[PDB]
Amino acid sequence: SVIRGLAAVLRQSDSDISAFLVTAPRKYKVYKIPKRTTGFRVIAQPAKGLKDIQRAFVQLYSLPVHDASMAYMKGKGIRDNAAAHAGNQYLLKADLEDFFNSITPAIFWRCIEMSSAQTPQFEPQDKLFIEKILFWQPIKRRKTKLILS
DNA sequence: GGAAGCGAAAGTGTCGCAACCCGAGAGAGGAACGATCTCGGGTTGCGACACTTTCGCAACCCTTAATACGTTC
């Protein structure tokens, strides 16, 4: 079903979407961006074909997001985030470690299962395709390690 | 995640020294052997240190990226 939806949006055949997705987790270009002090960050960008599929997926399936989440939200940004705290005198900042690379298919599916608000329902057959759409395989030899980039 | 080279940490084995034991031997005391002391060789316990083994830092960025200027993750 996910495949049919994507094929319709991208005006492609079910077969060509399915074929592309077989090795989608490996279709990432890896490069370095300089840090502002010394050193580099390593970035993995999906190939163009995969980016299109990923955008289509996000368009087709609305996942719930809390109002406290300020990043990547339409009409919100760093100004809104800062303004939320401007009237208070005491401040605490905390950070999550390796945030994106900590999110695995296992976490994703657990969150789907646990979620209070109306999550899209996926057929078991679609779960494998979704994993291939959303998660990157950093290590060629280790097919079992999929993470968000 | 983890190349290649490197060294920290930690466990094990080696080996040389000191202390001890043993029998051999020249020959004090005084006039018959053999007292006392030292040579030379062997054993055993000890502990400092050499040797061995494992771990972990982080090169590379995989065929697969985009290019109007800034900010944030």
Among chain A residues 104-123, those with CB within 7 Å of any atom of strand B? none
Query: Which three-class secondary structure state does DSSP give residue A33?
Result: strand
Contact present, A14 and A7 (Cβ < 8 Å): yes
Task: State which residue has its Cα closest to the C1' atom of B2.
Answer: A139
State the structure-solving technique: cryo-EM
Q: How many CA atoms does the CB half-sphere of A88 hold within 13 Å? A: 7
Cα separation, A102 vs A80, whole angstroms:
27
Q: Is the CB of A138 under 7 A from strand B?
A: yes
**Ordered DSSP codes for A58-118:** HHH-PPP--TT--TT-TT--HHHHHHTTTT-S-------TTHHHH--HHHHHHHHHH-SS-
Q: Is the CB of A30 under 7 A from strand B?
A: yes
Contact present, A47 and A29 (Cβ < 8 Å): yes
Diameter of chain A measured on Cα atoms: 58
Cα separation, A55 vs A68, whole angstroms:
24
**What does the CA dihedral A95, A97, A98, A99 come to, rounded to 10 degrees?**
-50
Tokens linked to A94: 């905390």
Query: Which three-class secondary structure state does DSSP give residue A136?
Result: strand
CA of A141 to C1' of B6 (A): 28
Q: Is the CB of A23 under 7 A from strand B?
A: yes
Q: Which amino acid, residue A98?
A: D
Q: Find and list the nucleotides of strand B having atoms within 7 Å of a protein beta carbon.
A: 1-2, 61-66, 71-73
Q: Is the CB of A139 under 7 A from strand B?
A: yes
Tokens linked to A130: 């979704």
Query: Which three-class secondary structure state does DSSP give residue A55?
Result: helix
Burial of A133 (0-12, 13-18, 19+ CB in 10 A): buried
Give which of A73, A47, A58 is closest to A9, Cα–Cα: A58
Burial of A72 (0-12, 13-18, 19+ CB in 10 A): exposed
